[PDB]
Amino acid sequence: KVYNDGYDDDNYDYIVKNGEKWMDRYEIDSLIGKGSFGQVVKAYDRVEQEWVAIKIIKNKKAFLNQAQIEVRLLELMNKHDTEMKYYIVHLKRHFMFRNHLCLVFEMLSYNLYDLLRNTNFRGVSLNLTRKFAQQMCTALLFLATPELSIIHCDLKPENILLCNPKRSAIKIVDFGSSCQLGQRIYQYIQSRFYRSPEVLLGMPYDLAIDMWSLGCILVEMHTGEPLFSGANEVDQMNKIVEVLGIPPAHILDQAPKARKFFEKLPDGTWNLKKTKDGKREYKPPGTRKLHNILGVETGGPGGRRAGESGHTVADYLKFKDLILRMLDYDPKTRIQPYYALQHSFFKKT
Ligand SMILES: COc1ccc2c3ccnc(Cl)c3n(CC#N)c2c1
Numbered sequence: 001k002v003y004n005d006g007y008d009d010d011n012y013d014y015i016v017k018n019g020e021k022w023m024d025r026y027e028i029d030s031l032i033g034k035g036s037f038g039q040v041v042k043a044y045d046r047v048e049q050e051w052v053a054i055k056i057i058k059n060k061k062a063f064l065n066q067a068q069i070e071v072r073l074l075e076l077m078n079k080h081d082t083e084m085k086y087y088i089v090h091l092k093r094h095f096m097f098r099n100h101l102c103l104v105f106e107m108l109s110y111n112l113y114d115l116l117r118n119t120n121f122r123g124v125s126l127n128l129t130r131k132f133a134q135q136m137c138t139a140l141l142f143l144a145t146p147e148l149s150i151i152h153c154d155l156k157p158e159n160i161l162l163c164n165p166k167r168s169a170i171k172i173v174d175f176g177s178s179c180q181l182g183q184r185i186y187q188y189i190q191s192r193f194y195r196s197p198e199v200l201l202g203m204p205y206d207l208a209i210d211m212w213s214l215g216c217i218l219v220e221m222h223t224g225e226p227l228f229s230g231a232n233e234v235d236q237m238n239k240i241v242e243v244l245g246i247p248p249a250h251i252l253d254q255a256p257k258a259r260k261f262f263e264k265l266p267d268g269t270w271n272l273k274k275t276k277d278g279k280r281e282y283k284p285p286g287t288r289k290l291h292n293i294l295g296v297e298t299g300g301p302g303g304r305r306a307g308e309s310g311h312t313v314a315d316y317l318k319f320k321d322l323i324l325r326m327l328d329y330d331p332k333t334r335i336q337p338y339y340a341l342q343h344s345f346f347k348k349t
Pocket of ligand 1: 034
């Protein structure tokens with residue numbers, strides 16, 4: 001049963017072969033990544049004399065047409081940003097090869113999941129978490145500039161890569177899920193752990209959904225574990241409710257899928273759906289305090305940062321305050337990137 005003349009496999013992916021030369025130019029070293037979109041390979045560019053990364057989009061229409069948007073958007077961002085400046089991966093060129101759209105990128109280093117893993121999920125320091133937060137907020141400031149108005153739509157540790165193994169410099173990758181403020185084209189989006197209330201609730205969204213993600217990410221970066229590790233949409237919403245409480249009546253009143261997670265009393269207040277059989281699985285609303293998760297006054301997450309430098313209680317109080325502003329239920333009031341950069345948490349040395 002041949003797929004695309006035997007170049008693809010049963011899942012519309014190109015069968016990678018180490019040492020293959022493409023178009024008398026690119027030498028394929030190895031497979032280095034995978035995802036919904038397809039594959040990413042490490043390759044040497046004879047012409048330019050450099051190592052690159054080539055993202056090999058799946059050979060199917062729906063997946064192609066989506067990478068076409070990733071290209072349009074990267075080209076548009078690299079056009080403003082021609083100093084490789086603003087914390088966004090660089091699209092060198094692209095081409096069609098054996099019926100696969102291939103995108104050639106600069107070669108980058110570890111993503112932030114690999115980096116968490118490397119500490120055996122103990123978390124990185126608060127100092128380092130600050131650096132990622134400063135850059136990510138700046139990248140998100142960039143994305144918001146009115147010419148662009150770009151929603152990334154799938155922020156997560158795995159889509160933030162270091163430039164260099166032993167350095168804090170980072171770039172955001174994978175704009176395959178991405179869109180612009182007007183041209184909104186989907187319902188079920190963002191990775192689940194990093195999905196915003198408004199998306200869960202089936203409401204319309206804007207750029208603020210990335211900020212939500214960013215909040216989930218920064219906590220995870222310092223503690224080692226996802227702030228809201230939900231196994232599906234109902235679990236996920238419930239894990240958020242543990243920490244932050246019930247979402248304001250004015251939001252739920254507008255949410256088409258409010259009733260998937262909640263129910264409205266006779267008196268007009270909302271509450272979690274009534275459950276069953278003397279079962280209890282979650283902590284009551286608002287009870288899982290972020291104050292304890294970060295371990296503000298107990299030596300950091302898990303007491304593992306006890307009596308270290310640059311982890312004072314004050315550092316944590318700032319860091320906490322920022323994060324609660326990033327996780328505001330209301331997207332009209334969730335801190336925006338301009339203002340986040342001015343937050344106390346960055347006041348200098
Ligand atoms: C390790 O170097 C790179 C460089 C660019 C990319 C890159 C660019 C656009 N989209 C994705 Cl998903 C990208 N990955 C994912 C992986 N693995 C990259 C990895």
